Design a binder for this molecule. Structure first.
Ligand code: KCL
Ligand code: NA
Ligand code: NA
Length: 124
């Protein structure tokens, strides 16, 4: 059983466009997306496809870069911090579900360092 994927729209949630959020889509997301290690994170985990019947027994706030991309494209977020929190949830979910040294964790570790490099300095 898969749960429904995270929402990418919510009509009662207030939306905002900011310079930092535009940068998070144009630069941060689109750069990370092309990395050799981005592919496991470009869509919600499909627990039936991937044979991870315990994934959503362990991971209660799932997140992935396909969801983040759609949220940015839909102006779903109020500010850049909210979007950064989604990236952080995505990385930490990977560390939680797996264990140190796993190939997928090495991938997340590399992407997290690139992500931090890109958000170290943001537009005003
Ligand atoms: C995302 C995510 N977070 N924890 C997990 C656990 C499994 C998973 N399957 C994706 C396909 C795959 C299986 N073994 C690998 C090792 C490294 C990179 C990707 C894979 N994705 N996954
Ligand atoms: Na774990
Ligand atoms: Na930057």
């Amino acid at each position: 059983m898969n749960p429904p994927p995270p929402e990418t729209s919510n009509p009662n949630k207030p939306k905002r466009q900011t310079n930092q959020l535009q940068y998070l889509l144009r630069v941060v997301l689109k750069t990370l997306w092309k990395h050799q290690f981005a592919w496991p994170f470009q869509q919600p985990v499909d627990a039936v496809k991937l044979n991870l019947p315990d994934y959503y027994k362990i991971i209660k706030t799932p997140m992935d870069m396909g969801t983040i991309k759609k949220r940015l494209e839909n102006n779903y977020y109020w500010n850049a911090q909210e979007c950064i929190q989604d990236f952080n949830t995505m990385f930490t979910n990977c560390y939680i579900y797996n264990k140190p040294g796993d190939d997928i964790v090495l991938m997340a570790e590399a992407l997290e360092k690139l992500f931090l490099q890109k958000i170290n300095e943001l537009p005003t």
